[PDB]
Amino acid sequence: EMEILKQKYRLKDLTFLLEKQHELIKLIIQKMEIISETE
Amino acid sequence: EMEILKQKYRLKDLTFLLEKQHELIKLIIQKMEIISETE
Amino acid sequence: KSPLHFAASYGRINTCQRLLQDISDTRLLNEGDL
């Protein structure tokens, strides 16, 4: 039970960090500027 | 079984978010402009 | 040579279009960089 709970906490931390990373990448796409491929 | 199924759902959500993040990063590489290192 | 490979590798369609439109002899598309 202790090992399974530790794995679950590791996965929860991975999930939280992935949400933060996804938000940061969305910000990168939102704020970056494009001057060559403007279609 | 319930704990294992919860872990499996967490991993599935991580996988889906990783696909979305990879697509966003591929878009970033596709749309970003480079004026210094054009080789 | 290298810029065309880089643009085609990462889907930079505008660069490929503006680079391959120079000549119609088609000497760049048929090459292998390593």
Q: What is the resolution of this structure in A?
A: 3.1
Spell C11-31 as b/e; 16+ CB within 10 A means b. Answer: ebebbbeeeeeeeeeeeeeee
Angle at B17 between CA B11 and CA B19, to 5 degrees: 105
The whole-angstrom separation of Cα B27 and Cα B5 is: 33
Cβ distance of B26 and C3 shorter than 8 Å: no
Residue B14's nearest CA partner among A11, A24, A27, A23 is A11
Angle between helices B2-31 and A2-31 (to 10 degrees): 20
Nearest CA in chain A to C16: A37
Annotated ligand binding at A8? The verdict is yes
The whole-angstrom separation of Cα B25 and Cα C13 is: 17
Cβ distance of A36 and C15 shorter than 8 Å: yes
Question: What SS3 class is residue C19?
Answer: helix
- Within chain B, residue ranges assigned H as helices are 2-31
Cβ distance of B30 and C12 shorter than 8 Å: yes
Angle at B22 between CA B16 and CA B27, to 5 degrees: 130
Please give the DSSP secondary-structure letter assigned to residue A16.
Answer: H
The whole-angstrom separation of Cα B9 and Cα A38 is: 40
Task: Please enumerate in sequence order all residues whose Cβ is within 8 A of that of A37, keeping only pairs 6 or more positions apart, or say none.
Answer: B30, B31, B33, C12, C13, C14, C15
Question: Is residue C30 within 8 Å of C20, Cβ to Cβ?
Answer: no
